[PDB]
Amino acid sequence: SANNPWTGFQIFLSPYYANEVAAAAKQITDPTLSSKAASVANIPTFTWLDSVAKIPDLGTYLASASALGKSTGTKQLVQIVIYDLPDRDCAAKASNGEFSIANNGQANYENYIDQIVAQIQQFPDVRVVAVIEPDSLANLVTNLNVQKCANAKTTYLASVNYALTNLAKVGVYMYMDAGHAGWLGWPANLSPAAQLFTQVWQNAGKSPFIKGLATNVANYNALQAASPDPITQGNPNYDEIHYINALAPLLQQAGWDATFIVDQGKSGVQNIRQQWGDWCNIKGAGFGTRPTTNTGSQFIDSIVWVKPGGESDGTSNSSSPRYDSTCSLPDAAQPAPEAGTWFQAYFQTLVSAANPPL
Ligand SMILES: OC[C@H]1O[C@@H](O[C@H]2[C@H](O)[C@@H](O)[C@@H](O)O[C@@H]2CO)[C@H](O)[C@@H](O)[C@@H]1O
Numbered sequence: 001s002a003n004n005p006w007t008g009f010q011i012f013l014s015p016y017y018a019n020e021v022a023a024a025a026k027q028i029t030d031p032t033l034s035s036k037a038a039s040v041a042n043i044p045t046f047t048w049l050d051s052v053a054k055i056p057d058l059g060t061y062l063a064s065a066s067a068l069g070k071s072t073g074t075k076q077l078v079q080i081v082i083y084d085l086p087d088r089d090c091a092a093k094a095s096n097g098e099f100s101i102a103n104n105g106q107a108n109y110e111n112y113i114d115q116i117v118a119q120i121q122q123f124p125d126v127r128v129v130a131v132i133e134p135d136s137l138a139n140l141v142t143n144l145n146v147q148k149c150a151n152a153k154t155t156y157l158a159s160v161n162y163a164l165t166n167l168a169k170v171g172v173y174m175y176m177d178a179g180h181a182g183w184l185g186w187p188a189n190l191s192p193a194a195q196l197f198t199q200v201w202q203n204a205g206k207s208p209f210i211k212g213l214a215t216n217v218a219n220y221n222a223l224q225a226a227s228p229d230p231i232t233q234g235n236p237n238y239d240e241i242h243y244i245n246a247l248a249p250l251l252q253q254a255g256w257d258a259t260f261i262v263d264q265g266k267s268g269v270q271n272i273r274q275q276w277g278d279w280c281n282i283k284g285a286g287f288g289t290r291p292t293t294n295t296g297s298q299f300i301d302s303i304v305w306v307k308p309g310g311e312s313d314g315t316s317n318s319s320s321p322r323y324d325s326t327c328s329l330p331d332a333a334q335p336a337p338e339a340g341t342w343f344q345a346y347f348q349t350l351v352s353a354a355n356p357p358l
């Protein structure tokens, strides 16, 4: 609609991903592939605040973006992921985090938010777009029978609400994570999802800064598939555009003219999964459609790269306390390192298989 957060701004490139990509490119032995790989650092991505250790990094990004805007004549936009809930990743094992409910988890989380707000407050000339807590709300829609999720429900809702309420006070544009077509896009899940997202939006005061929802984060779905991926059998909403087209009117009828962003960073190669629920380090994935506000849909503000391709989805080591057997399936690249850490061989394949090519 009228106010697309990306209009009129230059996106500040992630220095964190740039550091990973530059080091990765120097280890890619074929020169042509290496130069393609290095160019990935010039593609805008979201930087994840997956621990309190990343908050000072945010400060450096905001200050660097502010200075760059001054010296290039532009207004700069910093893209972040808020990803540190207590009892994080409640329906899987791979991305358990540093906060736990019993260890002052909710209070520590809200202070994590306070530290982030305190950084953002110092740089009002820099726009921030934040994806709020990948997987969390989607787990509350469909996984309430998972006892870790059920026992985390009040903490998740309180923490997400605190993030939305307080990031809005410093003008952060926000997209709540909303799973993907194979998670919440099933027709049967659309209304339960809309009802929960509506309640969350209402609880945070319907802030104009809460733009809508993010989809496909860290997943592999097409935005628009000419033919359904065979894994989608039984779900007419076989790609993200079908999911968004079906969900958005429900939000509108609840009063929220929500818009969307869609991760395509690992979506260049379709039809490569055995089963739709295979989310971990899918082999043969390629970088997908480059970020753009030319989205092909009234509901979609931007195609984005949220998950930084090359950072692992999870370890394949069953000796790890974060081992999830999804990461050992036949379509998962193995051996794979701990979630979030660099997976060089996987990055090289993402480069080689990029569609459109790099
Ligand atoms: O999409 C990335 C996240 O997937 C989560 O699992 C989902 C899965 O994507 C769906 O396809 C379906 O199988 O339901 C699952 C939830 O039970 C996973 O838990 C997360 O760790 C991933 O980040």
Ligand SMILES: OC[C@H]1O[C@@H](O[C@H]2[C@H](O)[C@@H](O)[C@H](O)O[C@@H]2CO)[C@H](O)[C@@H](O)[C@@H]1O
Residues within 6 Å of the ligand: 233, 234, 235, 236
């Ligand atoms: O489950 C009831 C639901 O089925 C829908 O059709 C299914 C069909 O049963 C299945 O064989 C096929 O693989 O997927 C389609 C959906 O894409 C039917 O359209 C619904 O009316 C019905 O509620």
Ligand SMILES: OC[C@H]1O[C@@H](O)[C@H](O)[C@@H](O)[C@@H]1O
Residues within 6 Å of the ligand: 048, 049, 050, 094, 095, 307, 308, 311, 312, 313, 314, 339, 340, 341
């Ligand atoms: O790579 C982006 C994010 O992916 C998640 O799966 C990891 O748990 C995070 O540590 C990381 O920040």
